[PDB]
Amino acid sequence: AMSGPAAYASYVVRGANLVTAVSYGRAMRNFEQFMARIVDHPNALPSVE
């Protein structure tokens, strides 16, 4: 017996990646984390937890 997930994780190109996917021809996994670290906390050192 084991207990894992039941479904796939869903990744989809939503409203901010979809502009750079169309216009630049490059997209990114999870835009919201890249934006919330470059401009929101620019001096946050990479910690583990």
């Binding site: 989809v12 190109v13 939503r14 409203g15 979809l18 996917a21």
Partner: protein, 49 residues
């Protein structure tokens, strides 16, 4: 014009004029791509499609 001169008197005149219809035919040509046709029929659910 009613004349009183020595020639034969004036008789009324009809002219038969035959007007026809000329026909003009025009065609405008349009190309549509085969990969542009194929994704008109295709099923779509993701916001990039």
């Amino acid at each position: 014009i009613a004349h009183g001169d020595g020639r034969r008197p004036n008789k009324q005149r009809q002219y038969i004029v035959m007007k026809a219809c000329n026909k003009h035919h025009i065609g405008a040509e349009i190309e549509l791509a085969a990969a542009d046709i194929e994704l008109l029929f295709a099923e779509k659910e993701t916001p990039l499609d």
